Ligand SMILES: C[C@@H](O)[C@H](N)C(=O)N[C@@H](CNC(=O)CCn1cnc2cc(Br)c(Cl)cc2c1=O)c1cccc(-c2ccccc2)c1
Ligand SMILES: C[C@@H](O)[C@H](N)C(=O)N[C@@H](CNC(=O)CCn1cnc2cc(Br)c(Cl)cc2c1=O)c1cccc(-c2ccccc2)c1
Ligand SMILES: [Zn+2]
């Protein structure tokens with residue numbers, strides 16, 4: 001269950017000293033990444049999020065207005081052109097505010113939910129880098145909700161539901177929840193923090209989620225909820241964050257025309273659920289020990305003949321699976337069926353569809369799992385229908 | 401007028417600002433177009449048997465010095481530093497593709513190896529020269545590098561040419577000008593290697609019956625090239641596609657494979673992009689169609705609306721059915737005149753406006769209006785869904801008539 005070992009074995013990715021903590025995604029690795037993106041996109045649609053894409057770099061002057069420069073400039077990559085200094089984006093929030101600030105906004109536009117697969121770069125110490133877990137370049141399943149003070153509870157409620165919804169897909173049901181309260185140094189009144197902490201608390205209560213306080217660990221600019229999932233080894237992974245922000249919109253001149261016709265500053269909610277896509281792929285690799293659920297598998301089905309005699313039946317079946325939208329390969333090599341099964345088992349291919357004379361003659365196929373189980377000979381169309389359902393449902397469980 | 405800048409703002413596709421010169425903020429509807437263009441390219445990558453990879457955003461100046469690009473183009477590169485080490489923000493994807501190729505033992509059986517990437521490139525271009533989506537600092541290349549043997553070059557150039565015209569024809573671009581650039585004075589390799597390389601490009605074009613003009617002496621140091629310039633409906637020239645042979649970079653970056661003789665051999669590299677800059681191509685398409693995108697590219701493909709509050713449930717039902725069919729659809733149940741609603745969706749360039757009166761609800765039908773203003777009449781819901789699915793899946797340039 002070492003993602004670095006499994007990563008090399010299944011040709012998913014590699015790292016080099018020429019680019020510390022920045023992943024070279026190979027074909028099969030990039031297939032997993034993209035299917036994870038497709039999955040998160042389906043949830044973005046289901047929870048009424050926009051999806052945007054921001055530039056990689058923006059003027060340091062803009063980043064100075066955020067307050068991040070003074071506190072995190074040493075963790076930021078910088079580059080200059082024509083006597084102007086640009087920061088390579090470590091976060092997507094300022095970029096999202098720039099898009100919000102294009103066009104006059106009304107209370108009618110709120111809540112405005114803006115998601116991005118945000119490419120972030122952090123100048124992390126090289127010596128502390130570790131595989132996909134501790135990197136310099138990562139992709140955040142990021143979103144910023146612009147909303148009224150009155151909309152916070154409902155919007156945080158929806159974030160909590162989305163968190164549990166997405167973790168459950170991967171078989172993560174043990175979640176530890178922590179609400180971080182007002183720190184010693186903070187902006188706004190004690191009243192603002194009372195209401196803000198209460199909003200996070202009520203949202204968790206509305207979802208029947210038990211939690212505990214991290215007293216005084218809240219950010220300068222608002223309280224947060226943190227979600228720690230536990231893998232099958234009972235190891236803790238902090239992935240999910242919901243962070244209230246009463247600072248950044250004001251700092252970056254974000255406003256909307258209220259129902260009272262007065263100009264108002266929107267509340268900002270930061271949330272990531274997976275956190276780092278790269279890290280989450282790392283966690284899944286170790287969770288499944290490379291046995292990715294069928295919907296995530298680089299190659300989902302290998303169709304294979306026992307002898308040369310079934311080659312054309314394999315070709316027809318491989319085309320049928322291709323047409324069904326399944327990631328399929330034909331193994332037509334002049335090798336023992338045992339040799340083929342062993343190789344594709346080692347490559348963690350969910351299903352091996354074996355075609356002998358008996359299968360061809362009956363219009364059936366013999367189904368073998370990477371777990372070494374023989375499901376027997378089944379109707380081709382019934383198997384294809386079943387594989388499609390398992391893939392569409394993003395099921396953790398293989399055919400019975 | 402068909403200014404991509406004007407349409408980009410009007411349809412909420414993108415914006416650019418002084419704090420990020422020549423770099424694009426893609427808004428929801430613009431990012432929808434970008435992603436559909438990506439889906440299209442990926443369909444071709446599968447058909448033409450390409451792998452798809454993702455490389456790091458930055459790599460050590462030391463490696464960029466090995467390529468030779470540093471000496472020639474250091475001023476056009478963005479650089480950043482960490483722990484007394486200088487890094488270049490990648491202006492090209494080729495060195496990264498070699499890095500992935502160099503991982504794992506390669507044999508002649510692995511060739512041709514076709515490696516594609518939607519490659520984030522950055523060029524430190526003069527800020528005064530930037531304009532719209534056409535000249536930018538940050539762009540995305542529909543890039544690929546083919547690692548092949550000398551013998552495989554002609555066949556791989558042939559497939560590249562077919563892919564180029566396949567993609568350009570999808571968008572209705574049939575006027576393509578082609579230029580073959582031959583050996584310069586300072587070049588690598590034998591006169592014989594250049595003889596074979598130039599012939600491979602020429603014969604590939606001739607066999608495809610592609611008229612081309614030679615650009616004698618204008619080829620690169622490291623090999624000859626074909627360039628494809630497409631013309632829009634205003635007869636403006638856009639150089640988008642390149643097929644560039646490279647007998648230099650694989651050697652420079654220690655690329656090798658085990659030949660059939662079990663001896664180490666340097667692979668030939670083919671650089672190829674078809675759209676060129678994805679951002680620029682979207683700009684070209686925005687102007688070509690004047691924001692009237694073909695249905696498959698349209699941010700919102702269908703709007704379903706009611707005549708009274710009686711049909712509001714039937715509209716919601718039809719809206720869900722269209723969504724399940726894989727169509728980008730929205731319901732408009734607002735208390736506004738039908739003439740007001742249809743004008744808003746026509747201005748937003750929605751291909752199809754589906755209207756539900758009592759006659760439509762009763763018959764299980766829907767009235768279909770095109771954004772051009774053609775009334776196709778009251779048609780069977782399932783007939784309409786299947787017609788829309790076919791138009792989208794075929795990526796048809798034309799709407800139902
Ligand atoms: C959800 C986003 O919209 C939000 N902007 C954000 O990135 N929040 C952080 C957690 N928040 C913080 O970490 C705040 C403190 N902090 C820390 N390091 C920084 C480093 C830089 Br270079 C800059 Cl500019 C700011 C900060 C900063 O504010 C966050 C939330 C969830 C997962 C992860 C994460 C987990 C594992 C790997 C990578 C990232 C990070
Ligand atoms: C297809 C890729 O695999 C290949 N690497 C590549 O990018 N080729 C260039 C055309 N090639 C050249 O232009 C070669 C000369 N050149 C010029 N400027 C550079 C600037 C830098 Br900063 C560096 Cl590092 C290298 C070069 C370089 O080699 C190419 C090909 C097709 C469209 C476009 C393009 C068209 C419009 C906008 C943006 C890009 C560019
Ligand atoms: Zn944020």
Ligand SMILES: [Zn+2]
Pocket residue numbers: 492493494545671672
């Ligand atoms: Zn290249």
